Structures are given as C-alpha cells and as structure tokens.
Amino acid sequence: GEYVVAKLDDLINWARRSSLWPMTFGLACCAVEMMHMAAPRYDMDRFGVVFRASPRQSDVMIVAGTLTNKMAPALRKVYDQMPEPRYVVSMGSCANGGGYYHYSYSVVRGCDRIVPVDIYVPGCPPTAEALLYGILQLQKKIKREKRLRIWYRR
Amino acid sequence: GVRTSPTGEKVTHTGQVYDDGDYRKVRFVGRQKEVNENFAIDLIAEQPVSQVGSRVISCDGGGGALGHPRVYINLDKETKTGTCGYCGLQFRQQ
Amino acid sequence: ASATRFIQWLRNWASGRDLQAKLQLRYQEISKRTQPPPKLPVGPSHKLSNNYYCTRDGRREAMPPSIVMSSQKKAVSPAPPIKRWELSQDEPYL
Amino acid sequence: HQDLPLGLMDDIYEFSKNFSLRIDELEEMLTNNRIWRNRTVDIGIVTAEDALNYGFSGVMLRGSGIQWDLRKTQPYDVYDQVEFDVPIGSRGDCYDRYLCRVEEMRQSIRIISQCLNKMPPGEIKVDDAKVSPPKRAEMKTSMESLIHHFKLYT
Amino acid sequence: LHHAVIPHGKGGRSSVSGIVATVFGATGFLGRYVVNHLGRMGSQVIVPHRCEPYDTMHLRPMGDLGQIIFMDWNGRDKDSIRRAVEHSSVVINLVGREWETQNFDFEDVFVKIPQAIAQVSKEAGVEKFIHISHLNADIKSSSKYLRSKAVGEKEVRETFPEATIIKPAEIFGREDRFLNYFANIKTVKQPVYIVDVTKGIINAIKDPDARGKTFAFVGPSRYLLFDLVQYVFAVAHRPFTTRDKVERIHTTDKILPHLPGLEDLGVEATPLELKAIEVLRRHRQPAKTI
Amino acid sequence: KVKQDMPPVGGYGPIDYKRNLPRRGLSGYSMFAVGIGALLFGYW
Amino acid sequence: TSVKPIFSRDMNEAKRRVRELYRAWYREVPNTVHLFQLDISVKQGRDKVREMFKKNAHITDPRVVDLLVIKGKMELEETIKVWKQRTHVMRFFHETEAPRPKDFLSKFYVGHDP
Amino acid sequence: TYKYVNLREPSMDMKSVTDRAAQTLLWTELIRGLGMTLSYLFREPATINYPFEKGPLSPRFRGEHALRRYPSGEERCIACKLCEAVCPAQAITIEAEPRADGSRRTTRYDIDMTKCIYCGFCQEACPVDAIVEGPNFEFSTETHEELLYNKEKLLNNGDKWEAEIAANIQADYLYR
Amino acid sequence: MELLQVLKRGLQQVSGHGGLRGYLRVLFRANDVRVGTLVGEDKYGNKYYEDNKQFFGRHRWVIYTTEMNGKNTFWDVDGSMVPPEWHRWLHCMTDDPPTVKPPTARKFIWTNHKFNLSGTPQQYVPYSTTRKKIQEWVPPSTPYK
Amino acid sequence: RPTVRPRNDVAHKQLSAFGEYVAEILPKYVQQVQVSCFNELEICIHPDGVIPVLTFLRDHSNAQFKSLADLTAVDIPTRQNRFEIVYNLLSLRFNSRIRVKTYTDELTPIESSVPVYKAANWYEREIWDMFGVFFANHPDLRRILTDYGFEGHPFRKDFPLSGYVELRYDDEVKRVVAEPVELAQEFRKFDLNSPWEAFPAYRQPP
Numbered sequence A: 001g002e003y004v005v006a007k008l009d010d011l012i013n014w015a016r017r018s019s020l021w022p023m024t025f026g027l028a029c030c031a032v033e034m035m036h037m038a039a040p041r042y043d044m045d046r047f048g049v050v051f052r053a054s055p056r057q058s059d060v061m062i063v064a065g066t067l068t069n070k071m072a073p074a075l076r077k078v079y080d081q082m083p084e085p086r087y088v089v090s091m092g093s094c095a096n097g098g099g100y101y102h103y104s105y106s107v108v109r110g111c112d113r114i115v116p117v118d119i120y121v122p123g124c125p126p127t128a129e130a131l132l133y134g135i136l137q138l139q140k141k142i143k144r145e146k147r148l149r150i151w152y153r154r
Numbered sequence B: 001g002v003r004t005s006p007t008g009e010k011v012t013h014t015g016q017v018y019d020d021g022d023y024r025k026v027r028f029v030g031r032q033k034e035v036n037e038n039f040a041i042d043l044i045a046e047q048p049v050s051q052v053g054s055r056v057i058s059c060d061g062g063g064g065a066l067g068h069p070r071v072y073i074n075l076d077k078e079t080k081t082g083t084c085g086y087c088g089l090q091f092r093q094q
Numbered sequence C: 001a002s003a004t005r006f007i008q009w010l011r012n013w014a015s016g017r018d019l020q021a022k023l024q025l026r027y028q029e030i031s032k033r034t035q036p037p038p039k040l041p042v043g044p045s046h047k048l049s050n051n052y053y054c055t056r057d058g059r060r061e062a063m064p065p066s067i068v069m070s071s072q073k074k075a076v077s078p079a080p081p082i083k084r085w086e087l088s089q090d091e092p093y094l
Numbered sequence D: 001h002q003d004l005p006l007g008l009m010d011d012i013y014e015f016s017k018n019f020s021l022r023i024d025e026l027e028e029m030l031t032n033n034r035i036w037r038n039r040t041v042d043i044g045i046v047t048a049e050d051a052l053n054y055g056f057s058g059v060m061l062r063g064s065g066i067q068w069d070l071r072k073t074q075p076y077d078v079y080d081q082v083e084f085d086v087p088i089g090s091r092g093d094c095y096d097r098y099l100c101r102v103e104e105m106r107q108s109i110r111i112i113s114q115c116l117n118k119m120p121p122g123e124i125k126v127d128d129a130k131v132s133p134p135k136r137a138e139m140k141t142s143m144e145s146l147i148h149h150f151k152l153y154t
Numbered sequence E: 001l002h003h004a005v006i007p008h009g010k011g012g013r014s015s016v017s018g019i020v021a022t023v024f025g026a027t028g029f030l031g032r033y034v035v036n037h038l039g040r041m042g043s044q045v046i047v048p049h050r051c052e053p054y055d056t057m058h059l060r061p062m063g064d065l066g067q068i069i070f071m072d073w074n075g076r077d078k079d080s081i082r083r084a085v086e087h088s089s090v091v092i093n094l095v096g097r098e099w100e101t102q103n104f105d106f107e108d109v110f111v112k113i114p115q116a117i118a119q120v121s122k123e124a125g126v127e128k129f130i131h132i133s134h135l136n137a138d139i140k141s142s143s144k145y146l147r148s149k150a151v152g153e154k155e156v157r158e159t160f161p162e163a164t165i166i167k168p169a170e171i172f173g174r175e176d177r178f179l180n181y182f183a184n185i186k187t188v189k190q191p192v193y194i195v196d197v198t199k200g201i202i203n204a205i206k207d208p209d210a211r212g213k214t215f216a217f218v219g220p221s222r223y224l225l226f227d228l229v230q231y232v233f234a235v236a237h238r239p240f241t242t243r244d245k246v247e248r249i250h251t252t253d254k255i256l257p258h259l260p261g262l263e264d265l266g267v268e269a270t271p272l273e274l275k276a277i278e279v280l281r282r283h284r285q286p287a288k289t290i
Numbered sequence F: 001k002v003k004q005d006m007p008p009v010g011g012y013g014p015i016d017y018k019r020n021l022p023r024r025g026l027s028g029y030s031m032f033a034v035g036i037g038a039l040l041f042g043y044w
Numbered sequence G: 001t002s003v004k005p006i007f008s009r010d011m012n013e014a015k016r017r018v019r020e021l022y023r024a025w026y027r028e029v030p031n032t033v034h035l036f037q038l039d040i041s042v043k044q045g046r047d048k049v050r051e052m053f054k055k056n057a058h059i060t061d062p063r064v065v066d067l068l069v070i071k072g073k074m075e076l077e078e079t080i081k082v083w084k085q086r087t088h089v090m091r092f093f094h095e096t097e098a099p100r101p102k103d104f105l106s107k108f109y110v111g112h113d114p
Numbered sequence H: 001t002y003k004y005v006n007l008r009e010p011s012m013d014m015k016s017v018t019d020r021a022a023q024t025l026l027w028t029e030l031i032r033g034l035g036m037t038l039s040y041l042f043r044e045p046a047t048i049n050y051p052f053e054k055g056p057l058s059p060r061f062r063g064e065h066a067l068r069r070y071p072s073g074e075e076r077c078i079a080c081k082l083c084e085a086v087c088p089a090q091a092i093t094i095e096a097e098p099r100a101d102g103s104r105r106t107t108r109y110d111i112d113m114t115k116c117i118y119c120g121f122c123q124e125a126c127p128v129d130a131i132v133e134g135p136n137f138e139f140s141t142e143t144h145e146e147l148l149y150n151k152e153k154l155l156n157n158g159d160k161w162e163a164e165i166a167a168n169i170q171a172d173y174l175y176r
Numbered sequence I: 001m002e003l004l005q006v007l008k009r010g011l012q013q014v015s016g017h018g019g020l021r022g023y024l025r026v027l028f029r030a031n032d033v034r035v036g037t038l039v040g041e042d043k044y045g046n047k048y049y050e051d052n053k054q055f056f057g058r059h060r061w062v063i064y065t066t067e068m069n070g071k072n073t074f075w076d077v078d079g080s081m082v083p084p085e086w087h088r089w090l091h092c093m094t095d096d097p098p099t100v101k102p103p104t105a106r107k108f109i110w111t112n113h114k115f116n117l118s119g120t121p122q123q124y125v126p127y128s129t130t131r132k133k134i135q136e137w138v139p140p141s142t143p144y145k
Numbered sequence J: 001r002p003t004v005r006p007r008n009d010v011a012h013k014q015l016s017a018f019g020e021y022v023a024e025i026l027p028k029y030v031q032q033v034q035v036s037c038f039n040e041l042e043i044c045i046h047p048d049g050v051i052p053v054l055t056f057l058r059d060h061s062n063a064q065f066k067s068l069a070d071l072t073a074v075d076i077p078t079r080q081n082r083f084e085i086v087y088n089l090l091s092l093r094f095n096s097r098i099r100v101k102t103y104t105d106e107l108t109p110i111e112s113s114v115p116v117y118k119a120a121n122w123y124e125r126e127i128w129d130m131f132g133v134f135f136a137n138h139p140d141l142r143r144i145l146t147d148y149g150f151e152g153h154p155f156r157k158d159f160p161l162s163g164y165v166e167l168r169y170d171d172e173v174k175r176v177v178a179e180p181v182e183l184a185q186e187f188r189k190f191d192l193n194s195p196w197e198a199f200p201a202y203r204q205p206p
C-alpha cells in the first residue's frame, strides 16, 4: 500500500520532470538568454526540455521579460489554457518584481500578480546558466511532489 | 553577541526582535530567522590598541588601495585612544 | 581536435573546407585565465604644474545658441553637396 | 568604465581569425538555396524614394540602392580612421537586404581587425574628474578626488 | 491594539487591514473567496493546508508579498492547529466535505475537527472565531451530513461561546456543487450567492455585534426544486453523486425568522437570476418564486 | 612601466573576411551525361 | 479670446457631435454585451454610457467638448473592433473596488484623507 | 566606398545555361547544403555538461550581492548612502544611527533583488569596498519574498563568499 | 586501424574509473565517463578533475559528493554545492586551484559552505531590521478618574 | 586640448548662412533662428507654417531634407503653449541636419505632416498618446503605446510617474482588474541640485 503509492509517485514525478516542455513568453531581453540556454553550449534539449512547445502541449511557462499592463491579460489567458500539471518560471528582475521599470505607470510589478509562480530566477538578465539552474531547481521541486501519497490519505 | 529574547527569538546586532504580542513573528513558523552571528561591534573590540610614537598617525584600513580613504588621527588626548572613523582601529601615543 | 583522420577527411569533404584549421571549439590558443597585474597609464591632466582647471574646462566653454534671426546675394545650401561615393577596389562586386 | 583586461585582445583576435568561415557556412545554407531565395527574392520591395519618405534607415535604405551610412557620412569616434565598404543592394527586396547584412558582418570583421592593430595606449575615460570619476586609488588618497567621487555618484 | 495591527492605507492590496486570520479549509470552494477578500484589503492570512502545495498555488496572487503564509496541518494533530492559530486575531473554519472517505467520516469533518480547532483557538487566546454550519442542520435529519452539522454546531457553541456561527443555505457560484450539480445531471430551496456569503463572513469579522451570534445566510427568493432544475436547464441551453447528497438536495430550506441574516451584516442578497448565467455559461424565463 | 592590453609588436596576422564559396562538382554537360548513362544501363 | 477650433465653431455645433456619439454608443452596447460575453445587462451597459456622458454635462467650451467626443470615438472604435478585451470593457464598472466612505464620519473612522 | 552585393549578369552561353539547367533538375545546390549539415554531424558538439561543468566567467562578473568586512571583522560599510543614491533602480534602502560604541553604522541595509538590475554601480560608488556583487549566480528561489535581502542576509553572503570575493577583487582592483 | 585505437580508448575509461561499477556509477550520476586528472578534493567530498586536451569549458569539471550537510546527493546534485574557494577555479575565474593558491583565512568566513536552501526550513525569511520608531504612552495601572 | 571638444567654425558659418536663407524665404512663419555651439541649426516657426515650411525644406533644391529623422514633443508647463513640437530632418544631398520647432497648447490642433513625410504617421500618434496633442487631418489618430482605455497622457510633466491605476488578476471575477495604485515602497524623491551656480554663461538676467 504505502510502498506502491510511493513507487508510483516516484515514477510519475520522474516522467514529468524528465519531460518538461516549456512555453516561453519571450517578452524582452531575458528572452535572449533563454535562446542561449537552447543554444549548443547548454542545449536544454539534452535534459528533455524541448526548444519550443505549443501552449496546449506545455508543462511550464517561462516569463522571460517585462510584463506590461497591456500584455497582462494575454499572459493570463495563455496560462489558463495550459493543461495541468502546469508550472511558471519567472525569469529576471522585470518578471520577478518589475525591476528597472518597477515604478512605471505601464508595467506590472511582478508577474506573480497575474499568475502563481513556482521559481524566481534573479538577474537582469540571469545568465543562461542561471536560468538552467532554475529549470533544474524546478525539476527538483517536481521530484518532491507526493500527489498520490496525499490522495491515498484523504 | 547573539542573545535570545524571553520568547526565544534571537536578537540581531541592530537590536531587532519581535515583541511578545507581534503577529509578524508568524513568518518564522516552520522556517527560521536569519541572523548573522559575527557581531562587528564585538569583533572590533578584540583588536589591540596600537602604540605609536607620534602625535598624529594615519590609517587607510590596511591593504593600501583596498582599504578606506586615508585619514589622520590626532593622539594628543591622554585620557582616551584615537579611533579611526572608518574601520574602528585604535591608536595610542606611547 | 580528437577526431580520427578518417572522420576529419569525411567532414572536410562534406563541407568543402579545411575545417581543422579553423575549429569553432577553443583549446590552448586562448589567453591564460590568470594574468600578471596591469599598470595603467594616467591621462594628460596628471601634472603638478601648468595645469589649472580653468584652461581645460570643457563644460564652461559651452555657450548659449547664437541667434541669427529673431522676430523680436547668392543662394546657399546647408553645406556643400555630398561627394559621390567611389566603388570599392577591394571587391566591387559580390 | 574600465580598461581592457590583459589578454582580451588576443582572444578577440583568435575569434575574429575564424569567424569568416562561420559566415561561409551560413552562406552555404542560405545564399544559393532555391527555397531561401523563393522566400526572400522580390519580397517586400521598397523603392529608394519611398524608403526615404517613410523614414527608413540602415539596410532598409541601402538595400534599395541608396548610398548612405552614417559611419561614412557623419562619422563619430574613430570611424573616420578605419577602412570598410558599405554593401549596397539593387532590388530593394528581402534577399538583397539579407545579402547586405551578411556582407556587413564581413566588413565588421574587417573593421575589428584594424581596431586590434591600431589600438593606442593611454587612459580610457576623460581626464576631467568633474565629469568622469577618479581612479579608486586617487579617491582614497586625495581630498579633491574624494569630493568629486562623492558628488558624481550622488 | 498592538501597533503592528493598527489599520493603515486606503484598503488596497498594499494596505494594512489589521486582520490576522487563520483560514482552515482555505483550499476549497468557499475558502478561495474568503482568502481573496482578506488579501484584497491587505490582511495577513495563514493558510493551513493538507493538500499538495501545487493545490494551493491559486491563493498566492491573492495577497501582497508576505501576506499569505502556508502551513502544513493535520486535522487530528492539535499541535499543528496550535502552530497555525497562536498568532492570529480571528480563526475561520471552512473545513467540510460533501462525502465520507475511508479516513474521515462526517463526524470527523463536522464534529471532531471543528471542536479541536475551536478548543485550541480558545486556549491560544484568539479573540474571534467564525464557524460555518448549515441552514438545515438538524439532529432529526435523514442526512448524516446535516445531523453532524447540528452536533458540531452545538459543540462549537459550548467550546467557544463567543464564536460567530454562520448557517448558509446551498451556495451557488462558479465552483459550487449546486448549480453545477444540476447541470451535470415538494422541496423548496433558498440558495445564496457565494460572494454574499463571503461578504457576510468578512463583515462578521469587523462587526463587534456579531460575536456570540448565529446567522442564517439565504438568498432573496425561494424556489421549488423542480422550478430551479428546470430553470437551470433552460439557462444552460440543455434539453430539459452520493445518496446522502440526494437527501440534502431534497431537504426544504428552513425558515428561521429568529436568526439574523445577511441584511444584519450590511450585505444585500444577490438574486439567482443575475448570477446564474455566470455559473452556467460554460455548460452551454426566470423560475417561479414562492 | 605602463602595462595595458596592447597588440603584439608588429601587429596580429591577417584576418580573412571575404566570401569564400569554393567551386565544386562537374559541368552541366557531364552531370547530364552521367544521369543519362545510368538510365541507359538501367534500361539495358 | 480668438482661438483655433478643432471641429466645432460653437456649442450648438459641438452638441450635435455629442448626440451622434451618444447614439453610436447606445446602439453598440447590445453587441458589446454579446461579443464580449459580459454578465452585465444591456440596461446596465447603457446606464453606464449615460453616466459617463452626464459627468461632462457642465462643459461650455466647444474645444473641450470636441476633444471629449474625439476621445469617446476612440473608445468606441476600440470596442467595436474588439481591440479591447473583456477586462478593458469591465474596467468601467469597478467590480473589485469596495465602496469608499463618502460621509464625514465614515471617512474620519478609517483614515486621514479629506 | 561601396560594393554591390547582388549585381551580376548570368552568362547566356550554352554551357552556362546547361549548368543552370543541371542545377535546377539535379538539385545540386540543395545537395551541397546537405553536405554542410552532414559535416556538422561529425563535429564534436559545443555542449558542456552542466552542472558538472560551468561556463567560464571573469573576476569582473556581477552576481549576487554581499556586504564585506575588514580583516578584523568590523563592517566596512559606514552608512554613507552613496550606493543608495546611485542605484538606478532604487533597489537599496538604508537607515543608520550611531552604534553603541559611537561607530557610524547601518541599522537597515536592504536590497530588493527583484528591483536590482545587477549593474554594479553600487560597488563602483562605495568608497570602502563594502557592498560588492559577488561571483554567485545560482541563487534562484521558490518565493518572491526570499529575494528581498535585509542586512543579515547580505552580511551572511559576505561571510559565505569572502574567500572568493577577496581573490576576485585582488585580480581586478588595478583596473579600478 | 583508427577505429581500433578508439575502441581501446573506450575500454581504458572503464578501468580508469575503477572497473565496471565505478564506470556505470559516473555514467548514471553525471552522464559522462571521461577520465581526467584529479586536481583536488574539498572537505565535503566533491572531487575536481581537469583535462587540458578538452576544449575550453569542458577542461574542468567536478564530481559532486554523494552526501553534503546531511543531504543525500547521490542523485540530487546542485551547482550551489561548490564551495567558494573551488568556485573560482571551476568557473575559470583563475588558473590555479585552491590546493596551490589557498584563500586567505579570516575568522568570520564560514567554515561550512551551504548550498541553496530555498524550499526548506532553513530558507531565508525577510524582515525589518530596525526598531520601533514611535513609543506609545502607557496609561497608569491604578484607578484615578 | 585633449579633454575639450573641438569647435567647428566652418560648419557653424554654413549653418548660420542657411538659417538666414530659410528666414528670408518664409518670413510669414519663421519666428527665430539659432545655431548651437555644437553646430545644430534650429528654425522656430509659427504653428501655421508647419506644412509650408516642411514642404519647402523637403522639396527646395537647396534644402532637400528628404528624411524625417524624428518627430516628438516636449512638455514645458510654465509656458502658455506648454507643448513644443520638434521635427528633426536629414538631407542626404547636402549631408546636413536641421531642426524645426513649433508650439501648441492642450486645445489647439496642429496640422498633420503626413502629407509631407509618410514617416510622421506613427510619430504623431505617439505624440497624441503621450502628450495629448491633437493632429488635424491625420489618417488614423489613436493611441499607439498605452493600454486600451488608458486615461491621461503619461509624458506630461504633471502625470505621476507610477500613474493612477495598476493591474492584478482577481480570482473572484476571474480576470485582470485595474485598481488605484498603492506602492509597497513609495518612490523616493531626491533633491540633487546644488545651490551653487554651475554655468555662468547661461545666467538669466534678474
């Protein structure tokens, strides 16, 4: 009972973190370091993280850049169309909390006002390696999930 | 120089601590209050006073251009020591 | 730089270039990651005399605009006509 | 802000030495590819007169045959001291503008080569501490330098 | 008042409402509205949760930075309850379940757990306690769900005499198991809107006359269950489930004139006709009221 | 003595930049001759 | 007092453009409620249109009225062409804003603002 | 000086026309493109094995902030607020008072790492090398709040990273 | 033939990692079976290797310890596990390792490096470090209206 | 002198002569002509002259300013006409730049220069959006940079930096909503100006 639920959780966790398909919202300059993470030096594909996935086939949204008020509704709409389980990675100061434009009349002070965020990657921009560290941190968060164990104890 | 309040919360080097009735200490429940344990006021006090032969000494904090702006300290007063306003090192005219 | 001679021949033939002469991976030709310390030069204002700031004060030589007409002979152009560019002698045509 | 670290110019030379081959590989993929030419040739044709009136600049001008480059006509810094050619299109379409950009990369390597050879010695910011902050060693020893540092950063 | 909980600001996200609320059952239908209203005005919300943190993610945007705090808790572990409430000025109990599981019966969810929360809160010195019961709670009910609500309502009143007890009718709303229940398919019903209930709970926290009182939260109109289901099908443009739930759905909504209601808290009940389209638009002539 | 990043005495070696797409393959005549020759052998 | 006009040379000319704009908005609300799948009634939408027009009833400068009409037509164009999303249309209604206190005593209890 | 990228006249002799016919029908230039991608298949890839291998950085790298000490352990910061004044993002908030021994020291030193643009102006402005951007770039978090650094966090960073920070300053201070 | 020398180079990596089990251990822990020169080891168990015939960026690497600070890191390794003295070398911020150029010692430097603590009870929680600004008047404790 | 930007008297003389040339040919519109110490020629005109002056500079054989480099506004509240409209033009024929400036207030339209330069289309939309200056006879005047339904003109000096409203997702209504702006940390205003005059050459008479 316990052993089966635990092993099954390990299996589904391993599959989900080993096949993370990102939808990248390339809003501004942070999107460039995301391209460099896909580029040969880091090759995010080698981790099972495909380069570009369709939003309806996506498991993680990477918000890579400044989220303006004009753009905020569209970003929420994409998030709501994502199939679960879905995670959000906030990349860089702008998406984390507004950054250089925190005090602007046109800028959302952090994408976490619009969507729940799983990982915050600091930097302006974070280096491609910093973003990769963040993606691997998300993989470890998924490895900690115990959905079936909690289901069994309901 | 870390000490704990009656409720157990560590007091910071700036003297900060949540009092008994403050709800805000709920933020540490299940986590921790980050406190640096190397109190600078205590560490500088351990440094010995430096004995010099002149009325005026200069301090740049050590390391040449890696220290602080060079200042000159008057040591005429015999009651007390001369203290550097940047790094806290103490001097005394022998 | 570790490819066997057969594979080196194969990819050179497929590309049509001598790829081994210009590898896109870096080996020992790059500069050491520890260097001797620099000793940087100083600028022209680093003098002990004949160096009064009022003789090298660019900001204070700025003047308000010259008003040439206020509402208070041959024709001219804003500058001479531009000269025709010359065709490259290095490689006029791709 | 700072002078070049020792050894940088050597590494730029090593990179520049090999880069034109990388442009060649890019050109082998695209320049003569019939599919690439089908997608770009005679696409988005803009006339020389239309380009000027619509406020175009750069390759959007030169692709249409206009002989204009601010580095040549209104030079700044030391651009008057380096030699290079301005690539010019003939058809004012996407394919010509693609060719201009590729050729501009080659001329950039040509300029970079001259910069490496002609790099002079000396200071790297204006010797006027009412504009550019003094060196840290001076800021820590001289009263005037410290005042000027304090004021330039506040 | 301790200086940290003096209200400041203009009632917005970055304001300080002065409320420190522990909301048990915050990850359900009712809790998401209660947390949202608390976080709208800048309250400190402690969210004890039993579920995976992935299941609490929708609550994070509901408050400014630091205003939503999540804790692990177990209904049977009184220490986990004490950790969650000992810093709060009000405790809101929204724990419930429409069915029984292998590990929790209606008696656990509606008697033992509410009593434990009320008792620990009393021990910890919490000033306010809000407990959600049910309009039709009755020791003489066919539904074991409603029988357990009556027993639990009594226990909370004994354990925390100053508790505010709220007794809502069936609640309709986007995530309800009421209008959605019919759309997925003698008795009179008086369903109440989710936002009305939330406003009543929020106002019961502020109102100093609410302590010690029992409220009944009902909608403005009474309908025949047949009239309601017919209306639901019409609004959903459709051609017109435990056994315990069936008994509940067929229990006529009680008329308790002696209890104060939403109007006594300054809340105007929302007609089902205005909000029915909002709930049912995704499943795609008002009903006769008594 | 002043020590800052400088080019080596005499400068760096030459750097290529011009397009270099070397000519390869046979002429159109020869290519067609090989193709027709293959067909004739296949037919035979 | 001699200024360049925008569109109208006097208030009567300006008041014509106001009426034309009002009619355009009045007839657009039913399609707006349907296209944006709003939960407000058509009457609410028109009641909101009227309220927006009425707060500007005290204007007597034709140039100011002209700009209000100019801006009102831009807002209509954004709506008819569905450049706006649902959030933008519903921003007129301030649904998540709690009712601020208006009388002196209520304002006194909550803060320092006039 | 200028050059023409695309101004050439095809030779219309029979040999040249037949050459272009062969290219059209036998897809010669397309095959030549296949050769390039084939030659890349047999090249060593440029990928590094992160996190076991790391991209090269330099001593100037601007990463996570830290507050430094003198060798004795006394704080370098003397609450001059030059960093706070220069910060382009207003990411720094400082309060100060006389310490119990009379020293000029801060009681608050916060950096909002989600406002910060990691520009390094603060460490240029500092007259005592107190605030620095250290070499660490692997400090992503699960919550927004963890990126709002107070003085205790920044002093802890300095004590955690001082061994590397000092060596990097040693390598670059002669360029500053 | 060359393909022969390649194949024996592959076999040498098996014995270079102390047999089949060690070879498979590094293959599954790090997805890399290269054999390099051991540059040093830190107090946490991380081992550092170099091979200057590899292209820049692959010429230095770390095999993370299987256990650090009470955490099982056999599978769960992290870039933040590299202590600062080796951080400079591994990122090519310098040429010489701490075994040849040790860092300067200070009494306040952490003796025990910590990796990223986000998502754990050791995570950092922000708070205001200043004391209360305004003191409220406390009424007397004896009746006297 | 190593640190001082050198003067260029030849260009200063040429630009001054052309400035008088333009003023002689369009006296109906030219109010002021000036050349800066870094040799930039500015023509200040009555707003009625926008189309005639720009057309002349574009088409006249001794001008040929065929390219509109930029078009923008500046807000100066102390002026009766607070908005300064700036046209920056480029002549490839004579390798020269000129700047044409006019003015307007909140309620006075400016004639659209789209007929002269098609480039003006979006620049004028930006000016309308950011400053609220209305351009007459524009083919399509509407906001270009701000959010739909955005109220006010943010680049005016009296528009607050953080604006009046801010956005967040609200779960109850299941959409992004706009609410009055509250900041967890207010923007900190700095008073930086020294109380000592820096530039005597620009001293204003008392």
Ligand SMILES: CCCCCCCCCCCCCCCCCC(=O)OC[C@H](COP(=O)(O)OCCN)OC(=O)CCCCCCCCCCCCCCCCC
Residues within 6 Å of the ligand: D034, F035, F036, F039, H024, H025, H026, H027, H030, H031
């Ligand atoms: C003696 C009697 C003899 C009688 C018999 C004589 C017959 C033999 C002599 C004639 C030879 C016939 C050759 C038939 C091949 C088809 C040729 C063809 O159709 O190419 C033309 C086509 C379009 O060419 P295009 O430049 O775009 O414009 C021309 C029209 N405007 O261009 C194309 O089709 C391009 C194809 C696009 C797809 C690109 C991806 C493919 C590239 C890799 C291909 C690899 C080769 C395939 C080998 C398959 C192996 C199974």
Ligand SMILES: NC(=O)C1=CN([C@@H]2O[C@H](COP(=O)(O)OP(=O)(O)OC[C@H]3O[C@@H](n4cnc5c(N)ncnc54)[C@H](OP(=O)(O)O)[C@@H]3O)[C@@H](O)[C@H]2O)C=CC1
Residues within 6 Å of the ligand: E024, E025, E026, E027, E028, E029, E030, E031, E049, E050, E051, E074, E075, E093, E094, E095, E096, E097, E098, E104, E109, E132, E133, E134, E135, E167, E168, E169, E170, E171, E172, E177, E178
């Ligand atoms: N909705 C209605 O029509 C009416 C509801 N009520 C009462 O209002 C309250 C909330 O209503 P609703 O929001 O619909 O209830 P929900 O079932 O929607 O959510 C119930 C909450 O209780 C928690 N919970 C349930 N069982 C346990 C348990 N065994 N241990 C710990 N936590 C538990 C759930 O957390 P998890 O997600 O972790 O299970 C969830 O957060 C309940 O008391 C309900 O009976 C009263 C009248 C009408």
Ligand code: SF4
Residues within 6 Å of the ligand: A028, A029, A030, A031, A064, A065, A066, A091, A092, A093, A094, A095, A099, A100, A123, A124, A125, A126
């Ligand atoms: S965080 Fe920095 S790099 Fe990223 S989008 Fe914002 S400004 Fe650009």
Ligand code: SF4
Residues within 6 Å of the ligand: H083, H086, H087, H088, H089, H090, H091, H092, H111, H115, H116, H117, H118, H119, H120, H121, H122, H123, H133
């Ligand atoms: S790095 Fe730049 S933005 Fe960040 S705190 Fe320092 S000065 Fe401010």
Ligand code: SF4
Residues within 6 Å of the ligand: H076, H077, H078, H079, H080, H081, H082, H083, H084, H094, H122, H125, H126, H127, H128, H129, H130, H131
């Ligand atoms: S860190 Fe440096 S610049 Fe900032 S307040 Fe302290 S001493 Fe001044």
Ligand SMILES: [Zn+2]
Residues within 6 Å of the ligand: B059, B060, B061, B068, B084, B085, B086, B087, B088, B089
């Ligand atoms: Zn000192």
